[PDB]
Design a binder for this molecule. Sequence first.
Ligand SMILES: [N]S(=O)(=O)[C][C][C][C+2]1234B567B89%10B%11%12%13B85%14B%1158B%12%11%15B%139%12B%1061B%12%112[C+]5%153B%14874
Ligand SMILES: [Zn+2]
Length: 257
Amino acid sequence: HWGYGKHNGPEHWHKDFPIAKGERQSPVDIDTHTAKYDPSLKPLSVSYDQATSLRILNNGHSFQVVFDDSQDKAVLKGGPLDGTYRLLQFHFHWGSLDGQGSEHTVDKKKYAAELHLVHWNTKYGDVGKAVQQPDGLAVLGIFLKVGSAKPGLQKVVDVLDSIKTEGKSADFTNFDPRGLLPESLDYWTYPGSLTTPPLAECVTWIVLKEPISVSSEQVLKFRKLNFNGEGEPEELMVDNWRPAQPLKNRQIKASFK
Ligand SMILES: [N]S(=O)(=O)[C][C][C][C+2]1234B567B89%10B%11%12%13B85%14B%1158B%12%11%15B%139%12B%1061B%12%112[C+]5%153B%14874
Ligand SMILES: [Zn+2]
């Protein structure tokens, strides 16, 4: 039932998923002046050399690129994390225009889009078990601004015409997610949740300070995706972002001064 529209969007989700009003919901606004530099935080370790992408999929909340998570091939460690987190998939959230689309905001600034690389804690064995734990998932969030093209995104862009409508997938092997990362691994971190149903409070968020630049042509191709299935009335897949939620009793920590 849930989506991003007037009658099924974020303001409705709490009816099916009451944790939507919980104590550690995501996304949030990152107030840069309030976030505290924490010298005890470690550099983030992103080890994607052996990543094995499998498929690209439209699921009617985004498109995702899925990875083989049956071994420690593409793992996130260090930073605020204890233990090892396997990359399952990445996906994006984006807007109808360049002034909105991100889920996290920075001093209330919205970016054109936000990339999420979703990882789960190997100590829970599978992602379904991991979502039931407060330290089950680590999501690496990366902001997208519009300017110069991101060459490492183009392979993704070019297959989106083949997964237009909900239910469509394609082979998407040999994709290297290192090509989506900014130079700096400077980050903010806080305890939060999935930003889609089931909104489980299972995520350590790691949001990079440095955005990547993508071209207008690249983001335009995101906006040609459809929320609907083939044969149903066409609804452009745009504005698939949850707004910032109350910070409540949480501290956002910065890895950098
Ligand atoms: N925007 S987000 O918080 O990264 C949630 C992405 C969708 C998920 B949630 B957890 B399991 B549940 B299933 B898998 B895992 B995360 B990916 C899909 B959905
Ligand atoms: Zn997401």
